[PDB]
Ligand binder design. Structure first.
Ligand SMILES: COC1=C(OC)C(=O)C(C/C=C(\C)CC/C=C(\C)CC/C=C(\C)CC/C=C(\C)CC/C=C(\C)CC/C=C(\C)CC/C=C(\C)CC/C=C(\C)CC/C=C(\C)CCC=C(C)C)=C(C)C1=O
Ligand SMILES: CCCCCCCCCCCCCCCCCC(=O)OC[C@H](COP(=O)([O-])OCC[N+](C)(C)C)OC(=O)CCCCCCCCCCCCCCCCC
Ligand SMILES: CCCCCCCCCCCCCCCCCC(=O)OC[C@H](COP(=O)([O-])OCC[N+](C)(C)C)OC(=O)CCCCCCCCCCCCCCCCC
Ligand SMILES: CCCCCCCCCCCCCCCCCC(=O)OC[C@H](COP(=O)([O-])OCC[N+](C)(C)C)OC(=O)CCCCCCCCCCCCCCCCC
Lengths: 70, 104, 99, 53, 99, 488, 39, 192, 90, 323, 65, 71
């Protein structure tokens, strides 16, 4: 686990090069940027058109080489 | 919300008094202060009832004078101060109409 | 909030001021009060170093002892200075300075 | 079933509390007599003390 | 009458906690529960006395007693957990090793 | 630091030092950089240093503790009585911390939370000694009670420690409930919580009558709680079991430190506030029971810790005769007895911890000690004779001055019972001395040498005990001044 | 400084809470006396 | 009448706590008696104290007791004793305490026998009615701060004791770490 | 008070409707939980103390504010103890 | 008298709103997932809640016979009581309150505290130990996030001198408290999400996953009552969010065109946006492990809530900005 | 008794308590303040007033009988 | 400012309400004193509305009910 600890320290030093980067990372982790982006995509699909087939009146496409009833 | 008895008498009530609070405190601050001083000196109601009687006389005279000076404005003010339980913020137009007639 | 500085026992020496300010009490620190602070801090640091050898944290032990000793020595020096300035202690030198 | 037993015990506790109210009223009523008894006893002790003195 | 009824109820709760301790010989959690009932009776007495006497000391000390009772319940359940883990059971005859 | 807090520098410093020690210990014991070091010794040394520093603060700032008299009057009042009581309490705490160092390393008990709780409980006893109200009294009592719960149950896997913790838990909670009911009754029937108000209301009127029945019950319940806190026979049943079960440093601290604080609290709540002959009668009965049953039960004991517990119960009974006389000489005798008993208990428990290296359990274990460790045998025999009350040693001074206070007390029955108990209870101390010196057992239990921390303390305490009869004027004068200053 | 940056990266939420608490204690400790003197 | 019903329910719940066979039922009846005491506080007029009784006693301490009792899984005949034998001593002690209550009430607090029309209303303290919560906060935080800071030490002691008594970290169990490189930067790699 | 009678009647009506809903078809170990509960007790006491402080900030001065801050600091040290010991982890 | 009429007029529309809320959750989640929700039981599926309730009523019950029949049956009753009595205080406009308690905030906090007992007793009374363990987990999670919720309530109580929701809103008149305390509103929203076991932190609804839940043993009406209690709590805490950080029955910018709307419409609209946010977060995010969510509640939201309490108190005390 | 009333105003008879305390502080003998101590206790418990009302009620009821 | 306006309006009205309440209480207390005299005239050694307190300092009659004003 000493290797894991030193790898963690090296990575932390790598991604903490300057105050700008550390502040940006902290703000991104605190203000839920990825969550907001996922919410925006979800809202886009809420407002987009649907692909429901409306079964009894509209039926899915088939092919002449369909294996249905003997 | 009536604010008036059968024979033009002003009902003390609480809406009427709350409407005429500023007028009371401006007209007879004096014996109101005197009655409060007597109450502080001796809390017994019987020891000085005369100061309370003078305060009541002031309040009744002011209510009668205000009612006989402006009636429609005072009646509307008391009605709207009864509809909303003595909330001044909910009765602004009626209060302003009352202020114009009977100036402080 | 009301605060009263009156003490139960009357001071036995002339009172420069009943409730001296914190800055004035700190500035009243004589060489003896500085010696008190230095001795207490040094005792604490030495005790911390000598006790932290077995656990293996000599630097951390000295640091903890240093904070404890600084707090205690500053409290003792402030206590002595305030007691002198309120007349509880033999404040001959600052009584003369006030006079 | 325990709900019926719980309600029966609740009624019993209610009856006990009315009994407690009754004994409180009884104590309120029979206090003056205790007062004269205590006064008589205190008078006896005072007379005894004054005869000793 | 209201003060009489409240004081009688509080005294009855105190006696009921005493009875819980008395009857629960082989039960210890119910003994702690009876102690907590005693605490509740004390708090109720303090509150009703404050209300009757028009003094705020009863409310202050009832709040402090609530805090203390909560802390002591935390500590007591810690003791219960460690004991039950040590001997594997809560029976009283396993908690009689000292005599 | 604004100038009112001159009245609370010792407590503030001890609290801040406890917080600093807790933070340091946790952060450097949960550290993977090191090998998770046992920080108990380092934290204990720093806590002993903090205790010494706050002792110096309290001793040097003797007139400054009275600053903000009216500001602090609601919570506590400080005077010469509290000053000396707190000085003795800090000395006892420092001795207990110093003499329990070797227990840590050898017995592997490496929880610095023990030292943190030592400091926190010491602050609680400081607040208790200063306390001047029915609320601060309860708060300080409960603080030390929770600390002692955790202390007794400190050894988690130990069956004895867990059982002692559970028993002390339940019985202390019961006593807290009783004391709380007493406080509630007094508040309801008096309208007052401050000790000055209680004194003003209660003086001039006896507590035995139709009036103030609720006041009488509240005072009686508070007395019951305090008697439980001092292990009187009507409420003593916890003392031996928890004293045996809890780890030896914990039981030493329990036997030494809480006694002085609880007794100063009792003096300030009862002798000053609710002074009335019924309280002295209650404590007279409690003292009779304490002495008689302590002697009787310690005669039948065969374990060192249980014998020490019952000796503590008997000496509390003697402190209770001193209280139950309740005069100037009575209170001075109470203070003398408390000081002497604390010194003797420190001596005895230092010797016990010295013998803890080889895990001494029974009285027979220290048999043939006059050969393996001669000077230790003489030292422990001197301690046992001091507990007896043999004249040249310190215990006899407290003994005869308690008996003199009882003869000027008018309590001939109390004095006769006390002296008969003193004769009766000499037997088990003599049995200990026989076990060290007289017996020739088939096999001997060789005891490892001491640590310097216990050795210096034991030497100082034994020199004080043996040579106290050459110069008792300082202690007698100090206790007389404290008793006089209790009121004026 | 480097260790502080590493700590802020590794535990951002505790650093943010500490900064917020420091600001909350700093306003009445300094700015309140400053405003009292100014008034 | 409502007061009588409330403490009758409280007494019954307390008796069920005392004589309940199942400790879980004991906890539930303890919750019930706490609720009845809260109702009594409503009748008294201490809304804040009733709500804090609910929050602390009903919430915190009672969920603690419930958790520990259910997690123990105590069986019958492990905690079981006949109550008939202790009935005489319980009755004697309860009767002594009741007689002492009798003596206390007979002297100090005399009940009033039948009032409303004689109530003298001051009207002076009602212009700004201070709530119980408001008054308690003002007092407790201005002029009794020591008795407020001391319980903080008690809570700290309780937390320290709870940890030093009931802490057991896993000796050898893997713990997930989210600060890995593939989570942080994740440079893409291929077979070529 | 005079406002909790509607609450009591609401409770009674809720009981009635719940019983009706139930009766409609009839017509046809681990220490982590303990530690969490103890933390719950401590922070319930914290919030119980916050409520009057928060309400009466306007009356209590910087004295009261700093007393509450000292209370928190005394109890936040306990939270740091929890964090470093490992009580908050699962 | 009129009090039972008011109570019934609060309770029954609340049940209708809960039914249409589960229907709206289905519809919104389906529209998110590029499909259409219930559309075949009535026009646009408006009769779907009625059909579901009728089916649940007509389903024949089963008796587990768990030797704890009373406690098994009464736990959903307890949680239903708690949800309803919590709803007994929430205002809708100026004067639409049953109990205008001066301690309304602490009343709601206490009712939320009592809410764990229904689930705890449901888990214990069930024969299976998996249900008991799941109930314990859910209870602990609600405990932690209710501590956080109480701290947020303390922040709001620092902002507003009073403790009743109506006067809270009357203070909200100026700035809605959401503009000053948007991070506090976000933390309160996440805490109430974890309080009702909805969205992320969804342990009981992860039945297809190994955690199972406390509702496995429950019959048709027990499960229905637990679901109704959970959704009533969801609506309750949405109302709490809008009364605490969105001004309740208050328009935007106080324009006179906006004042034509009664205000109860404003409160309803804000509650609808909060419910839409509930369904949005549930549909858009994965769920946390139990240990992860517990550590997040005890290590991320509690320190932040304490820090925000301290910051708001420091801002208000330093400046004359104090009520 | 402290003057902190239950409704944020002056206590019910903190004035009586202060009269008794001043008498005790300036008195030559503690029995001099017996009347004021009786007044303070009577305010605290209403014992004498309640007894007077109870005996009035008893006389009224026995006259009816 | 709004709350201060409301409280200032309340304070100006207070003296007349207090006067009315004082007169009402005086009338009721005089009626009670007359009732007490007419029901207690038979027993000797009975005063008319004697105060159990000393040194004056009139206090309102005890109601026997805890907090009667809140209800
Ligand atoms: C996700 O899966 C799930 C579903 O799918 C979506 C479900 O539906 C359900 C079940 C959910 C429900 C909402 C079923 C309950 C159905 C109801 C309609 C609720 C009951 C409501 C009432 C009984 C109130 C109706 C009362 C009326 C109409 C009286 C009217 C009175 C007057 C007009 C005045 C006097 C005359 C569950 C559990 C589920 O898990
Ligand atoms: C100036 C007055 C104080 C002098 C202190 C001298 C050192 C005492 C501590 C020490 O080294 O003990 C050695 C002993 C034994 O250490 P040791 O056994 O490791 O040393 C011998 C090592 N070999 C075998 C390799 C040769 O250690 C202890 O007793 C434990 C640590 C005690 C720390 C005490 C700190 C406070 C001391 C008083 C301060 C005032
Ligand atoms: C107008 C008057 C009308 C009548 C009024 C009086 C009605 C009767 C009141 C007494 C109670 C009767 C029902 C008892 C049922 C007990 C069932 C049982 O065994 O439960 C097991 C439980 C133990 O729990 P358990 O777990 O064994 O539960 C099993 C329950 N069963 C049997 C139903 C399956 O026992 C107890 O809890 C002990 C109860 C003792 C009795 C308490 C009664 C209430 C308090 C009475 C106070 C005094 C009243 C009289 C005062 C007189 C004046 C001073
Ligand atoms: C003077 C004061 C000035 C203040 C200036 C602003 C500072 C704000 C700092 C606090 C932000 C609080 C709000 C965010 C928050 O609570 O984050 C906690 C945390 C952020 O940290 P984290 O917990 O995600 O981090 C991972 C864990 N550690 C800490 C170990 C790295 O947020 C979450 O945990 C999110 C959980 C899921 C939420 C799902 C619902 C989202 C709804 C929409 C949101 C938009």
């Amino acid at each position: 686990t000493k290797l894991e600890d030193e790898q963690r320290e090296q990575l932390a030093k790598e991604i903490s090069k300057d105050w700008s980067s550390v502040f940006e990372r902290s703000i991104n982790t605190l203000f839920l940027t990825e969550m907001v982006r996922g919410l925006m995509l979800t809202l886009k699909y809420f407002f987009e058109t649907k692909v429901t087939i409306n079964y009894p009146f509209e039926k899915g496409p088939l092919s002449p080489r369909f294996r249905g009833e003997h | 919300a009536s604010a008036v008895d059968a024979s033009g008498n002003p009902i003390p009530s609480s809406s009427v008094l709350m409407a005429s609070s500023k007028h009371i405190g401006i007209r007879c601050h004096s014996e109101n202060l005197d009655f409060l001083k007597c109450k502080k000196k001796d809390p017994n109601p019987e020891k000085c009832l005369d100061k309370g009687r003078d305060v009541t006389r002031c309040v009744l005279g002011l209510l009668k004078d205000l009612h006989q000076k402006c009636t429609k404005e005072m009646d509307d003010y008391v009605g709207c101060m009864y509809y909303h339980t003595n909330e001044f913020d909910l009765c602004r137009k009626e209060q302003q109409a009352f202020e114009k007639k009977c100036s402080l | 909030m009301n605060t009263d500085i009156t003490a139960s026992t009357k001071p036995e020496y002339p009172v420069v001021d009943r409730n001296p300010p914190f800055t004035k009490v700190v500035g009243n620190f004589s060489t003896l009060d500085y010696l008190r602070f230095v001795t207490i801090t040094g005792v604490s640091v030495t005790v911390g170093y000598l006790s932290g050898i077995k656990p293996g944290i000599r630097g951390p032990s000295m640091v903890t002892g240093g904070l404890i000793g600084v707090m205690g020595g500053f409290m003792y020096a402030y206590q002595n200075s305030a007691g002198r300035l309120m007349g509880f202690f033999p404040n001959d030198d600052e009584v003369a300075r006030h006079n | 079933v325990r709900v019926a037993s719980y309600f029966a015990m609740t009624l019993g506790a209610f009856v006990f509390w009315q009994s407690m109210d009754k004994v409180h009223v009884w104590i309120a009523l029979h206090q003056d007599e205790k007062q004269e008894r205590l006064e008589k006893e205190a008078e006896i002790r005072r007379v005894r003390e004054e005869l000793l003195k | 009458m209201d003060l009489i009824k409240y004081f009688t109820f509080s005294m009855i709760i105190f006696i009921l906690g005493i009875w819980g301790i008395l009857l629960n010989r082989r039960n210890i959690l119910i003994m702690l529960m009876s102690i907590e009932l005693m605490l509740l009776a004390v708090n109720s007495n303090f509150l009703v006395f404050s209300v009757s006497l028009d003094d705020m000391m009863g409310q202050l000390f009832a709040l402090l007693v609530l805090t203390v009772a909560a802390a002591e319940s935390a500590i007591g359940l810690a003791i219960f957990v460690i004991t039950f883990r040590v001997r594997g059971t809560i029976a009283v005859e396993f908690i009689n090793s000292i005599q | 630091m604004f100038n009112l807090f001159l009245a609370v520098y010792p407590e503030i410093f001890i609290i801040n030092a406890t917080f600093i020690l807790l933070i340091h210990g946790v952060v450097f014991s949960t550290s993977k950089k090191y090998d998770y070091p046992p920080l108990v010794s380092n934290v204990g040394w720093l806590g002993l240093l903090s205790v010494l520093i706050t002792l110096l603060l309290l001793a040097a700032g003797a007139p400054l503790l009275t600053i903000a008299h009216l500001f602090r009057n609601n919570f506590f009042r400080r005077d010469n009585f509290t000053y000396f009581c707190q000085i003795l309490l800090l000395l006892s705490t420092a001795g207990t911390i110093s003499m329990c160092f070797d227990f840590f390393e050898q017995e592997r008990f490496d929880a610095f939370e023990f030292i943190v709780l030592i400091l926190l409980s010491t602050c609680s006893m400081l607040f208790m000694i200063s306390a001047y109200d029915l609320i601060a009294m309860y708060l300080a009592i409960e603080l030390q009670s929770l600390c002692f719960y955790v202390m007794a149950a400190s050894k988690r896997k130990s069956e004895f420690s867990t059982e002692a913790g559970l028993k002390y838990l339940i019985l202390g909670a019961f006593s807290s409930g009783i004391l709380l009911f007493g406080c509630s009754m007094i508040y309801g029937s008096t309208g007052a919580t401050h000790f000055d108000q209680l004194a003003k209301i209660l003086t001039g009127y006896e507590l035995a009558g139709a009036r103030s029945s609720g006041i009488f019950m509240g005072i009686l319940f508070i007395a019951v709680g305090s008697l439980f806190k001092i292990t009187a026979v009507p409420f003593h049943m916890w003392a031996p079991d928890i004293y045996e079960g809890s780890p030896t440093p914990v039981t030493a601290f329990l036997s030494i430190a809480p006694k002085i604080s609880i007794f100063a609290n009792i003096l300030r709540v009862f002798i000053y506030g609710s002074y009335g002959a019924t309280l002295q009668q209650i404590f007279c009965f409690c003292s009779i029971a304490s002495m008689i049953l302590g002697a009787l039960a310690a005669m039948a004991q065969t374990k060192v810790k249980r014998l020490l517990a019952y000796s503590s119960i008997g000496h509390v009974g003697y402190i209770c005769i001193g209280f139950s006389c309740g005069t100037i000489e009575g209170i001075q005798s109470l203070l003398i007895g408390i000081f002497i008993y604390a010194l003797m208990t420190i001596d005895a428990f230092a010797i016990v911890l010295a013998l803890r290296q080889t895990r001494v359990k029974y009285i027979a274990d220290l048999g043939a000690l006059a050969k393996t460790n001669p000077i230790l045998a003489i030292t422990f025999s001197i301690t046992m004779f001091s507990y007896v009350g043999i004249p040249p040693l310190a215990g006899f001074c407290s003994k005869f001055y308690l008996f003199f206070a009882a003869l000027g007390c008018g309590a001939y029955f109390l004095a006769s019972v006390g002296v008969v108990t003193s004769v009766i209870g000499c037997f088990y101390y003599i049995r200990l001395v026989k076990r060290m010196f007289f017996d020739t057992p088939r096999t001997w239990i060789l005891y490892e040498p001491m640590d310097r921390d216990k050795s210096l303390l034991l030497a100082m305490t034994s020199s004080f005990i043996t040579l106290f009869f050459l110069y008792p004027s300082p202690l007698f004068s100090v206790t007389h001044q404290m008793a006089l200053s209790l009121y004026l | 400084m480097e260790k502080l940056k590493m700590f802020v990266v590794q535990e951002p939420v505790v650093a943010a809470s500490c900064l917020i608490a420091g600001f909350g204690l700093f306003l009445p400790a300094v700015v309140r006396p400053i405003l009292d003197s100014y008034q | 009448m409502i007061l009588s019903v409330l403490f009758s329910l409280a007494l019954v719940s307390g008796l069920m706590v005392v004589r309940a066979k199942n400790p879980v039922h004991s906890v539930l009846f303890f919750i019930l008696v706490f609720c009845d005491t809260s109702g009594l506080l409503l009748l008294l007029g201490l809304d804040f104290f009733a709500m804090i009784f609910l929050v602390v006693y009903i919430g915190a301490i009672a969920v603690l007791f419930l958790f520990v009792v259910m997690m123990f899984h105590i069986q019958i005949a492990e905690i079981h004793e006949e109550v008939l034998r202790y009935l005489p001593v319980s009755g004697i002690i309860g009767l002594i305490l009741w007689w002492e209550m009798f003596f206390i009430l007979d002297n100090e607090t005399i009940p009033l026998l039948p009032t409303t029309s004689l109530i003298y209303t001051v009207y002076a303290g009602k212009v700004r009615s201070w709530t119980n919560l408001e008054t308690l906060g003002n007092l407790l935080y201005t002029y009794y701060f020591v008795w407020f800071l001391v319980p903080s030490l008690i809570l700290l002691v309780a937390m320290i004791g709870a940890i030093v008594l009931t802490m057991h970290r896993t000796t050898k169990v893997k713990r997930q770490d989210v600060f890995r490189r593939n989570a942080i930067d994740f440079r893409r790699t291929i077979m070529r | 008070m005079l406002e909790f009678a509607p609450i009591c009647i609401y409770l009674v009506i809720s009981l009635l409707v719940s019983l009706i809903l139930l009766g409609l078809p009839f017509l046809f170990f681990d220490i982590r939980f303990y530690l969490v509960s103890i933390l719950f007790i401590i922070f319930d006491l914290e919030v119980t103390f916050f409520f009057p402080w928060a309400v009466s900030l306007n009356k209590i001065d910087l004295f009261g504010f700093w007393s509450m801050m000292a209370f928190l600091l005394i109890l936040t040290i306990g939270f740091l103890y929890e964090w470093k010991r490992g009580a908050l982890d699962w | 008298i009129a009090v039972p009429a008011e109570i019934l007029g609060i309770i029954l529309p609340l049940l209708l709103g809960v039914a249409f809320l589960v229907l709206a959750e289905r519809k919104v989640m389906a529209f998110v997932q590029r499909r259409k929700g219930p559309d075949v039981v009535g026009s646009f599926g408006l009769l779907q809640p009625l059909a579901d309730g009728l089916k649940l009523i007509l389903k024949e019950p089963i008796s587990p016979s768990s030797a704890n029949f009373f406690l098994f049956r009464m736990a959903p009753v307890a949680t239903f009581m708690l949800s309803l009595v919590a709803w007994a205080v929430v205002p809708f406009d100026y004067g639409m309150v049953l109990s205008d308690s001066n301690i309304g905030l602490l009343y709601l906090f206490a009712i939320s505290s009592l809410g764990v007992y229904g689930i705890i007793t449901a888990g214990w009374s069930s024969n299976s130990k998996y249900a008991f363990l799941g109930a314990l987990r859910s209870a602990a999670q609600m405990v932690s996030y209710e501590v956080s919720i109480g701290l947020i309530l303390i922040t709001v109580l620092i902002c507003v001198g009073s403790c009743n929701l109506s006067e809270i809103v009357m203070a909200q008149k100026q700035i809605w408290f959401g503009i000053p305390l948007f991070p506090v509103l976000v933390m309160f929203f996440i805490s109430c999400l974890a309080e009702t076991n909805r969205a992320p932190f969804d342990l009981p609804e992860a039945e297809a996953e190994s955690v199972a839940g406390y509702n496995v043993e429950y019959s048709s009406m027990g499960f229905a009552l637990f679901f109704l209690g959970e959704y009533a709590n969801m609506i309750l805490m949405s109302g709490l969010c809008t009364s605490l950080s969105l001004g309740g029955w208050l328009p935007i910018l106080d324009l006179p065109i906006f004042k034509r709307i009664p205000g109860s419409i404003w409160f309803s609209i804000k509650v609808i946006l909060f419910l839409f946010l509930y369904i949005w977060v549930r549909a858009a995010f994965p769920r946390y492990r139990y240990d992860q969510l517990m550590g997040l509640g005890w290590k991320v939201f509690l320190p932040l809530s304490l820090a925000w309490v301290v910051a708001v108190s420091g801002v208000s005390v330093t400046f004359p900005w104090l009520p | 008794a402290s003057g902190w009333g239950i409704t944020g105003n002056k206590g019910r008879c903190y004035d009586f308590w202060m009269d008794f305390s001043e008498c005790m502080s300036r008195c030559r003998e503690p029995k001099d303040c017996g009347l004021l101590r009786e007044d303070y206790l009577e305010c605290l418990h209403h014992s004498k007033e309640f007894q007077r009302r109870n005996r009035i009620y008893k006389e009224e009821q026995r006259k009816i009988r | 400012a709004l709350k201060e306006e409301k409280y200032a309006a309340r304070r100006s009205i207070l003296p007349v309400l207090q006067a009315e309440e004082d007169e009402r209480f005086v009338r009721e207390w005089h009626k009670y004193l007359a009732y007490e005299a007419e029901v207690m005239k038979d027993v000797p050694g009975w005063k008319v509305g004697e105060s159990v307190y000393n040194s004056g300092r009139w206090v309102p009659p005890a109601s026997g009910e805890l907090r009667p004003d809140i209800w």
